[PDB]
Amino acid sequence: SAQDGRYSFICEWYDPNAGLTRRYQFLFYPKDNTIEMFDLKNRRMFLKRSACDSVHLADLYVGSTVNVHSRQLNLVEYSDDFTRRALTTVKEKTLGLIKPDAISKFGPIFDMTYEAGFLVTNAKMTRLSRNAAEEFYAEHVGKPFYNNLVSFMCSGPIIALELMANNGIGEWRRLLGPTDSSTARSEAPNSIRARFGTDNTRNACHGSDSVDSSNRETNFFFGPSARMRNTSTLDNCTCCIIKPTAVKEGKAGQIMSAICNEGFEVVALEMFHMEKANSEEFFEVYKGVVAEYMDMVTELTSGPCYALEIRCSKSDDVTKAFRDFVGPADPEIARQLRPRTLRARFGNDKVHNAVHCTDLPTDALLEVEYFFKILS
Amino acid sequence: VRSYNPSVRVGNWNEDTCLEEDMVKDFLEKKEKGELLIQKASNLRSTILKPSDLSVTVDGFVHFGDTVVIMNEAAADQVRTQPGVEPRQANVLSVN
Amino acid sequence: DRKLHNTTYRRIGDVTDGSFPLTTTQDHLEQANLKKDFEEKEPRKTMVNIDTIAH
Amino acid sequence: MRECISIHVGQAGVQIGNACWELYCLEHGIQPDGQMPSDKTIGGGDDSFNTFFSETGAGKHVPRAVFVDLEPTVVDEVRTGTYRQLFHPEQLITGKEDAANNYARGHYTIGKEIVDLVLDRIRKLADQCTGLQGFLIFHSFGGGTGSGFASLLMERLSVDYGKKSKLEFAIYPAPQISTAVVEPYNTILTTHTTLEHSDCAFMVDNEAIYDICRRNLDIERPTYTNLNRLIAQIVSSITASLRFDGALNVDLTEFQTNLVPYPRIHFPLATYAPVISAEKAYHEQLSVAEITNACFEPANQMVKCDPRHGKYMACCMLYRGDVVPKDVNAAIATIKTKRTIQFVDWCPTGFKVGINYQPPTVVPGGDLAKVQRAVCMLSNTTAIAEAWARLDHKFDLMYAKRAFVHWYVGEGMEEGEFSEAREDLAALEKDYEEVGV
Amino acid sequence: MREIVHMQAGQCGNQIGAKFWEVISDEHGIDPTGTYHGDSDLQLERINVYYNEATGGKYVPRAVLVDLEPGTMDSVRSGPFGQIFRPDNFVFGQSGAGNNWAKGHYTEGAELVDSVLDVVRKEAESCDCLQGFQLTHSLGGGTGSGMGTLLISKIREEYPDRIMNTFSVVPSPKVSDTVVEPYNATLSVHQLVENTDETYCIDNEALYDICFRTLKLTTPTYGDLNHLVSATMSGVTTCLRFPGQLNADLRKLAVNMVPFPRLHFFMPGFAPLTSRGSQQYRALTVPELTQQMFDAKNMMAACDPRHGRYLTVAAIFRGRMSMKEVDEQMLNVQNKNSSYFVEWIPNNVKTAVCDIPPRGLKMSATFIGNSTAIQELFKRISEQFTAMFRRKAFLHWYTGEGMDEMEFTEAESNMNDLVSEYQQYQDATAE
Numbered sequence A: 001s002a003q004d005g006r007y008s009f010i011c012e013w014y015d016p017n018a019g020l021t022r023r024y025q026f027l028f029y030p031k032d033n034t035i036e037m038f039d040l041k042n043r044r045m046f047l048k049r050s051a052c053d054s055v056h057l058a059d060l061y062v063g064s065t066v067n068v069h070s071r072q073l074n075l076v077e078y079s080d081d082f083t084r085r086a087l088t089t090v091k092e093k094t095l096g097l098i099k100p101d102a103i104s105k106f107g108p109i110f111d112m113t114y115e116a117g118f119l120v121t122n123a124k125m126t127r128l129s130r131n132a133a134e135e136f137y138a139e140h141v142g143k144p145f146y147n148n149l150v151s152f153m154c155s156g157p158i159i160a161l162e163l164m165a166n167n168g169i170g171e172w173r174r175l176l177g178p179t180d181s182s183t184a185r186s187e188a189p190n191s192i193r194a195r196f197g198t199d200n201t202r203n204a205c206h207g208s209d210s211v212d213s214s215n216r217e218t219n220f221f222f223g224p225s226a227r228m229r230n231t232s233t234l235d236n237c238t239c240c241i242i243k244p245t246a247v248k249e250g251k252a253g254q255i256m257s258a259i260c261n262e263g264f265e266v267v268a269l270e271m272f273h274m275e276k277a278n279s280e281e282f283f284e285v286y287k288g289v290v291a292e293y294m295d296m297v298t299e300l301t302s303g304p305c306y307a308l309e310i311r312c313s314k315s316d317d318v319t320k321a322f323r324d325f326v327g328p329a330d331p332e333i334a335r336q337l338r339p340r341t342l343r344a345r346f347g348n349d350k351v352h353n354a355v356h357c358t359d360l361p362t363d364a365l366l367e368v369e370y371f372f373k374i375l376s
Numbered sequence B: 001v002r003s004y005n006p007s008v009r010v011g012n013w014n015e016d017t018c019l020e021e022d023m024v025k026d027f028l029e030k031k032e033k034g035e036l037l038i039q040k041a042s043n044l045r046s047t048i049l050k051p052s053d054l055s056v057t058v059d060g061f062v063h064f065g066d067t068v069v070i071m072n073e074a075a076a077d078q079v080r081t082q083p084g085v086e087p088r089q090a091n092v093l094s095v096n
Numbered sequence C: 001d002r003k004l005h006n007t008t009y010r011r012i013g014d015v016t017d018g019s020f021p022l023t024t025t026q027d028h029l030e031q032a033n034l035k036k037d038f039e040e041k042e043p044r045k046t047m048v049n050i051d052t053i054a055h
Numbered sequence D: 001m002r003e004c005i006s007i008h009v010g011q012a013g014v015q016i017g018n019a020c021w022e023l024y025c026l027e028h029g030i031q032p033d034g035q036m037p038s039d040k041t042i043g044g045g046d047d048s049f050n051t052f053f054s055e056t057g058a059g060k061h062v063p064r065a066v067f068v069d070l071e072p073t074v075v076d077e078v079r080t081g082t083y084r085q086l087f088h089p090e091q092l093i094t095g096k097e098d099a100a101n102n103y104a105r106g107h108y109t110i111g112k113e114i115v116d117l118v119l120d121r122i123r124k125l126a127d128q129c130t131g132l133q134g135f136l137i138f139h140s141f142g143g144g145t146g147s148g149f150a151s152l153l154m155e156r157l158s159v160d161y162g163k164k165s166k167l168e169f170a171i172y173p174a175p176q177i178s179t180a181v182v183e184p185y186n187t188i189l190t191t192h193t194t195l196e197h198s199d200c201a202f203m204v205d206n207e208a209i210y211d212i213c214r215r216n217l218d219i220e221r222p223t224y225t226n227l228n229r230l231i232a233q234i235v236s237s238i239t240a241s242l243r244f245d246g247a248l249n250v251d252l253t254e255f256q257t258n259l260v261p262y263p264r265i266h267f268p269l270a271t272y273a274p275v276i277s278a279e280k281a282y283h284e285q286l287s288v289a290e291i292t293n294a295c296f297e298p299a300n301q302m303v304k305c306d307p308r309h310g311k312y313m314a315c316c317m318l319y320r321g322d323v324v325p326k327d328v329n330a331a332i333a334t335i336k337t338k339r340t341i342q343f344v345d346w347c348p349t350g351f352k353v354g355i356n357y358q359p360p361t362v363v364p365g366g367d368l369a370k371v372q373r374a375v376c377m378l379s380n381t382t383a384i385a386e387a388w389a390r391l392d393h394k395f396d397l398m399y400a401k402r403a404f405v406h407w408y409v410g411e412g413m414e415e416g417e418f419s420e421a422r423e424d425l426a427a428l429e430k431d432y433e434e435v436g437v
Numbered sequence E: 001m002r003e004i005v006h007m008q009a010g011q012c013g014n015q016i017g018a019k020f021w022e023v024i025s026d027e028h029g030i031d032p033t034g035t036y037h038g039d040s041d042l043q044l045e046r047i048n049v050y051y052n053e054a055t056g057g058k059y060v061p062r063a064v065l066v067d068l069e070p071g072t073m074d075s076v077r078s079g080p081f082g083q084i085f086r087p088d089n090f091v092f093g094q095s096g097a098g099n100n101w102a103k104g105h106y107t108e109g110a111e112l113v114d115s116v117l118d119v120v121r122k123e124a125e126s127c128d129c130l131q132g133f134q135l136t137h138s139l140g141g142g143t144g145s146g147m148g149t150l151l152i153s154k155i156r157e158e159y160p161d162r163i164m165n166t167f168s169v170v171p172s173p174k175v176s177d178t179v180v181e182p183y184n185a186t187l188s189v190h191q192l193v194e195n196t197d198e199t200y201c202i203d204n205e206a207l208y209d210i211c212f213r214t215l216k217l218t219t220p221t222y223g224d225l226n227h228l229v230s231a232t233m234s235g236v237t238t239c240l241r242f243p244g245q246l247n248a249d250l251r252k253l254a255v256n257m258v259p260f261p262r263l264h265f266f267m268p269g270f271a272p273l274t275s276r277g278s279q280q281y282r283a284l285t286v287p288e289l290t291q292q293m294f295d296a297k298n299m300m301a302a303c304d305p306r307h308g309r310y311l312t313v314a315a316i317f318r319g320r321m322s323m324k325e326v327d328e329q330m331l332n333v334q335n336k337n338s339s340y341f342v343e344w345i346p347n348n349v350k351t352a353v354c355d356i357p358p359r360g361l362k363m364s365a366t367f368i369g370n371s372t373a374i375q376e377l378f379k380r381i382s383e384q385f386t387a388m389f390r391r392k393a394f395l396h397w398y399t400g401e402g403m404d405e406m407e408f409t410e411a412e413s414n415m416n417d418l419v420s421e422y423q424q425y426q427d428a429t430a431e
């Protein structure tokens, strides 16, 4: 009808020519899942009622990228007081920093977060340093747990997560359980801190205890002032792109757990909100020789993707070993032939397989550089 | 009257295709003999910007055969009494 | 208390909050701070640039 | 070394200078503080800013302009504006009383106490300049500071600097709309006293820019911001040959001794074109032939006078961007074969093109689109004789009844100066009608 | 640095001056004590045009309150915004003017004029540029009519090079409120026409009409009238105090509005003047402003411009606006009402833009007309003057007070000269 819920946000789209970032009003209508767009400055009607099938309610996430009709919008502001007070709840940023004790057991942690229903939006694997403890000088020299925890941050890598669920600060705390991992294992039987971790500060997470302290932690992390660096080291490695469909339907934890369990090693982790142009440059080798170029680009752009760098200690070559571990092209062909591999236990069709791999065993270095040194 | 890109078969597209083909020929021969500007900058960055260790003194005295970095301390008048010209920051002696 | 010389209106007209509308030459000159949206950022990151040439 | 001194006099000139120096700072990469953008180098390799900025010992670029207004109203706003530390404090001079639409108050009494100060500042800037190409005097014919003080300044610059070519940007009164009621008096007196002192008079109007912004830039409510931004684009395209490299460079001296046929005939018409908005340059390509045709249409002219009713003495065609010397020749050939535009019989070769490599700079807030090409057409034509005749008719309509004369008489001007100026412009009309035949 | 000294004469002059010093006090953010309770620097940039700096953050107006009774001087001191004036620019008499021009001009008001000139000379040498003097008085009264024009004459003799403007309240055709009002109008405007650069002639029943039918108010008192007069006075001089796209001070207005030195009688007007309850339902724009300016309804003087012809128009637009609309609609009103304009002055409208609106209104406009149709006012006052002067009516109160009838004959001859001078350009053909 005329009014059926009017979730409106300010969005910005950079016009590739003339250098402008034009400002538009996004007007998502629930109960029919439609989108409307107004043109700020020179009042007009940019998009009608429509029925766009790229934007869904779970996508939104002010601060993200949405591709409606190949215009890569960035949602930037909570316009309207109604939408501000209606999505201050439900959508909450929370930090999910995995401690270096669980540096090898992150796959099951991702599996439980996606089973609980936390839409991760940004993720990295970071080294930190002495001066990079702005996350933890808030609790400044209260006890020697300050020095012990700073040393624990400096020893070993971490995986920074930016999760979200309904009233997310508090369900993240419920998923973690209380602190003091021994006591947490004593009372909570299925929390992350109960399943993994040994004692105090060996707790596998830290949480996002209070609101706007979560915002401070994320702004020290992921954002326009983020000076964090990934743990990419190049050498004999290969790509482990995990597609947005497999990320969305609760399979990323299983995929990364299988990757870690069969062998290999995840050396660099990153989570991308890809664009149309960048997806086309990544899949430009998949031009009119396979004839799913458009669908592959669309499924990359239609959600967040997981970039992983894979090495191995089995020698041979990592590219061919990983290409043998991954199903070849199609889920049906991977199910009938070599069903113990990937892309068969996780597979729908040739477009949304589960994952992507370096087909040529001579360009994995260049693709890893494109992910972890170029587009970063 | 209008002009399209050479990918569209309207005007002088054959000669434009031959021209860009010869530019590709020149790029391949220059890459074969290794005198590209991008290679010339990339290997410069890869070789010169490589970290090196420094010899540690056990008594604070400089010894023969030590590595040593010769550096200049920053100016002690970082106030910008003359706006626009930057005061002398920390300098390190290096080779051009 | 009948004071026939009182104004009966403190100000003529009432559609304001007291602020001043930031005069036209000032609005002209403050547009120099609007170069962030006129910046020529390139969201067309090419697959090869100068660190991958050796590879 | 290719120096150029800008003198912005009048309340019109100060605002045109505001837009002009915003455009110059953007084009040469200069912050409102006057530094390089976030520094990162000083270098000294760059020299394109030397024509408009003075490279001091501090690495702080200051403009080579002089802001003059008799009233301290807009110069004070420039002082407490964003370009506060960019301008030198003594560089922005002003008085206490204003000339008040009175050419007598501009040229006499009130004007004859700041003329020494402005000549002193221009002398200091000329001693700064090594290789001064000339002067760019931005004023308005409308009256007061822009007429009387401009006439005094041009007279005492001509008798002090030799030739030293002077380029006057004039805000003409529009045929239908205008502001003052003594404006025909002021315009006629200032053009009579500047005819023998101006090397070239870049003529622009107000109703023409209003119609251009309504018709092509598509703003139903344009203003002096847009007007001054367009004039800034015109003068930037004119001086781009001095500043940046190009295939053909057309300097100032180039422009005078290629454009004007006779010393009295020095009133051309400007037309800068790409003329299009940001949401309409998106869909249409802007080729050299079509932008030259857009210049030669009788609707993009910056003065409200039809060039279809007069002949073209000369044309200067300044291109910016990626204009190729083949399609410029194609466009000029098409213009020459088009019979609607008539050229005079004694000038068979009547074009002077110059191609500059630098593309136009889009201002953060202006309505001009980011365009890779530009053409500025400066045509010496006979179509402004109609404007002169209309101005003299408006003059005679009041001067028959001797209205608004006692102000000038009491402020110092003799009563015969009005008649002498009328004689001079009647001579100018006769000169134009005997040249264009 | 241009400065204007304000001089208040009489009952009505003191009251409208107090309202003026209220409206340009809360335009500049000045509290009743005298400090600066403002927010922007534009208020304090050019406060020296109407204010003198004092000890601390105080600001004393450069206004001289003159009246020949303790009276309204005391009431202005007691009322609000009455502690802002210096208690030395408060010269008052002890006797009464008696609504008598002779009493104001020659008897006891004359011996206080020396102290008034002492005060004005002190405040004038306290200036730096001194653009000029403005005076508010009450033509038809006794203090502002005679002693006010004595002030006009002596100050014009003292400084015959600075802009001297007077606003003045002319008598109304309907009602009287003074029997000797035609006398105190005639031989006071006779003095006013000789030595004033521009006069504004704000009538009173027109103020009643504007208050009653543009603002309603049922009973409008005197504060609404003083408010309209004060708004007009502020809108005339706004360009001296605030920056704008196209400034126009008092000398710009005089040059662009006075063709001949004896034709400086003006038609003041203000826009918008819509009522308090009806202002929320109209889009306040340039077309509405221009039409509510140029209708004959909104004239703040009692003269109807339809019976005459406009010589010159001045439009001062206060507020941020795009003035292409302003220029094109000045064109439009000139072309639509070209019958009501002289044909021998092409472009007989003067446009000014000052992009700071008054507090309250988001955009406003002040109208100053030099229409020929002012001769009806002088003709009516001459008719009422010769009604009494042929029969020696109330002349003894002037002659025994000490004067002659030849001055009255000179005054009526000068008013008939003004009437003939306006009537010639009423229908002076061009060609």
Ligand SMILES: Nc1nc2c(ncn2[C@@H]2O[C@H](COP(=O)(O)OP(=O)(O)OP(=O)(O)O)[C@@H](O)[C@H]2O)c(=O)[nH]1
Binding pocket: D009, D010, D011, D012, D013, D015, D016, D070, D071, D098, D099, D100, D101, D102, D140, D142, D143, D144, D145, D146, D147, D171, D172, D178, D179, D180, D205, D206, D224, D225, D227, D228, E245, E246
């Ligand atoms: N194009 C353009 N013209 C302007 C601008 N400002 C004023 N003008 C012109 O200037 C005329 C008004 O006279 P001014 O030039 O302001 O007079 P002045 O130079 O200040 O000298 P005085 O009259 O003594 O104050 C108007 O008719 C306008 O056409 C502007 O910003 N852009």
Ligand SMILES: Nc1nc2c(ncn2[C@@H]2O[C@H](COP(=O)(O)OP(=O)(O)O)[C@@H](O)[C@H]2O)c(=O)[nH]1
Binding pocket: C005, E009, E010, E011, E012, E013, E015, E016, E097, E099, E138, E140, E141, E142, E143, E144, E145, E169, E176, E177, E178, E204, E207, E222, E223, E225, E226, E229
């Ligand atoms: N606009 C206005 N007019 C007034 C006011 N008070 C008195 N008048 C007019 O002034 C006239 C009387 O002149 P007056 O000022 O008393 O002369 P004075 O006695 O010499 O001061 C009357 O016709 C009134 O209409 C006022 O507050 N506002």
Ligand SMILES: [Mg+2]
Binding pocket: D011, D071, D098, D144, D145, E247
């Ligand atoms: Mg001016």
